[PDB]
Amino acid sequence: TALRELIEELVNITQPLCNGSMVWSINLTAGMYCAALESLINVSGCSAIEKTQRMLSGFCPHKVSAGQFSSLHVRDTKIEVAQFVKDLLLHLKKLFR
């Protein structure tokens, strides 16, 4: 349901994305919807990712603020939002199976 919709949205948006805006690479493990949400929350002025952020906020209802981290521990590799969505898309389709 919401998980298919989240995958649908990520494919829907990868058909550039947040041009000039880099996000942190996410360690995709134990239902890390919070880690994905923490990585994207630092993107400013991008209408294209709003739905994904709201959808992710549905799965992770905890307080998540821009700049402040709790879920994220692996802060080293910085990527394009397109690359991040493609990395999130690989993990999300693995959980769906």
């Epitope: 947040c18 041009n19 000039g20 993107v43 991008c46 209408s47 709201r54 906020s57 549905g58 821009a66």
Partner: antibody, heavy 118, light 112 residues
Framework: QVTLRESGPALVKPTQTLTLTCTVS????????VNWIRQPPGKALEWLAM???????VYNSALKSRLTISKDTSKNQVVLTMTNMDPVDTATYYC????????????WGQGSLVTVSS | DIVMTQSPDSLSVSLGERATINCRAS??????????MHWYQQKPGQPPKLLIY???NLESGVPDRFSGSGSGTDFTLTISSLQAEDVAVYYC?????????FGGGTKVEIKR
Amino acid sequence: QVTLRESGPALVKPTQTLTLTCTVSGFSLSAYSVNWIRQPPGKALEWLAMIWGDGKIVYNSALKSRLTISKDTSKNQVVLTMTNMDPVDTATYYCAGDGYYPYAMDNWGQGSLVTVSS
Amino acid sequence: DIVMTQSPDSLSVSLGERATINCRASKSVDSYGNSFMHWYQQKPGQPPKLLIYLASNLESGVPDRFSGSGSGTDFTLTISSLQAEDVAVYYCQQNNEDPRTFGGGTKVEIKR
């Protein structure tokens, strides 16, 4: 250190077009969303339009046919035009930037009062 | 087109007393269990200032006496101990659905 500053005429003749400019400093318009809001003296705030950093344009529904929002990333300015100005459009016009997700309007300009009169 | 309606239109409370403001949306401002509604304070001759976002989160630097609550259609802004500097007009606003809309405002005054 993000700042927004509105500029435009203090006075517009009835039926004429108002052109307002919002100059943004400290944030690139390629990743910064700018809103226009107005406030008639002693009345409620009225949201008018916005242009996201990635280009999405949204307008107030009742004033849609009269409004055009645009931007020039080079001069780092957002322009609002409103046609067929009437004395009822006399108001302080504010531009305001969105914060991060959930995208509330966290950064406001001082506002520019526009009077519509002959 | 989500219409935001505030009640009461104005209110007068003693210094150090609890103050409560209400806001009602015409449609739900919820998306995936979160409320896309925000509260602003506007002091005379100044632009509005964000106080609360996502219905209950305090904007950084805003005094802790302010709080927000509610879900779906009904929202509340609360000042635990009204201060002389809290005199202003308070506005609610939604961004759940385009276009963004503001409430009509509520003027808060001190009873002295």
